[PDB]
Amino acid sequence: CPLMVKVLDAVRGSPAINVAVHVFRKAADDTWEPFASGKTSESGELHGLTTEEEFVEGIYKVEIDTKSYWKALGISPFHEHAEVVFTANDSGPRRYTIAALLSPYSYSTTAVVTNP
Amino acid sequence: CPLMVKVLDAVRGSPAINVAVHVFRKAADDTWEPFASGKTSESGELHGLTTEEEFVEGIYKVEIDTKSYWKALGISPFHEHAEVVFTANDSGPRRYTIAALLSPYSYSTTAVVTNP
Amino acid sequence: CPLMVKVLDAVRGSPAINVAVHVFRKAADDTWEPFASGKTSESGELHGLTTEEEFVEGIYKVEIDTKSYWKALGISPFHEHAEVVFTANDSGPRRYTIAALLSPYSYSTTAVVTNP
Amino acid sequence: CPLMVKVLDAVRGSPAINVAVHVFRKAADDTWEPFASGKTSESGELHGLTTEEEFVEGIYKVEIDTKSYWKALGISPFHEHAEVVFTANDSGPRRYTIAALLSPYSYSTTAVVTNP
């Protein structure tokens, strides 16, 4: 699993289940191409979004639907969403893990770049 | 000042200076349309973006150019940029303070929403 | 001024009002002895803890009573309290600014040291 | 195991390897009595800190040595160390992952209590 997304709820202190995460990849036209899509499992992580061969070089946008997650719980959050825009595989084949900590009025995101 | 962005460097433990900040107010045709622009002062705070008269009930995008701040220092950051997207003033004249803590492979943004 | 302390609430998106704060400097006996106390204001801070003359070089510890804060709102937080142990005025006189973003199960604390 | 720990370097975007970890347990006579200890693995995880029998109801403190981690890298951190004081196993038997994101002048910790 080259690309991975890990999401947590800071209010309840557990994994953020069913959070719609959308992965786009840039284009020469500078428009966004829909690379992948999925929702986070009961563990709060969405692995198996892409494969080594398919995850080529480029700029990717990982967009997390935080507003929908909260609205479901009955809370109206600040952000409409939270996205992580980065340049992947520039140097070489690296395995990424994107983690995000959620709160109504704050969100935190860290990455963990690792060799295969 | 109903909208002020605050940015702090978490590696050197000081305010992030000269960080480019771009604000975009969503237009009626659903296109991100330029609202404000500026660079964080020496205190890390960027003020004087707009006024309440022209800070209408919409969806704004405060984009902080973190990539260039870090590259200037000689470091190579993970994120292309940090982006906060939210629906402002959808009730009444609220004052919005949006702050962000920066780290090369991590960052988090909080929002303090008050009113005079 | 030398020991400034802001405390935010990442759930309600506002400053944390009346959050107890206890500071302790390390005594020559390696035990923790009292130094200053007070509660955060409406703006979410306490600016009158000590003054240069009393804020000598040593090992300090700002303890923030997070437990009691979250217990009033009805919530049952994970931590008993947020602590920040650090060495003060090592490089001569400096002005410190501790800060914590509070959330039920997760807290974050940044430190900003500026020179007079 | 029932008590797992995680440290993550956010300056380099990698797991924090060889970080000292010391767990304490609230004694009966209100003093910090040693409970368990170890060092983080290649993945940044520290497992087998305690059995599913020693971890009885009490007030545990997890001290993560931040100071030496940064010193070794040439960096001059702000904090002497990260601490996580919490109450465990009062609602019954629980699993506790305790994460920490590090930066020279800022650290963040989150708890993920899972139910067996």
Ligand SMILES: N[C@@H](Cc1cc(I)c(Oc2cc(I)c(O)c(I)c2)c(I)c1)C(=O)O
């Ligand atoms: N392989 C790892 C996966 C893992 C990573 C993080 I990172 C995490 O929790 C946090 C803590 C903080 I602090 C953050 O800012 C964010 I985003 C997520 C959790 I739970 C699990 C393991 O399970 O051991």
Ligand SMILES: N[C@@H](Cc1cc(I)c(Oc2cc(I)c(O)c(I)c2)c(I)c1)C(=O)O
């Ligand atoms: N040096 C400042 C103090 C200060 C620093 C930060 I950085 C900050 O904003 C955040 C945002 C997030 I997201 C965090 O996780 C944290 I911790 C702090 C705020 I408000 C105040 C002064 O005295 O002016």
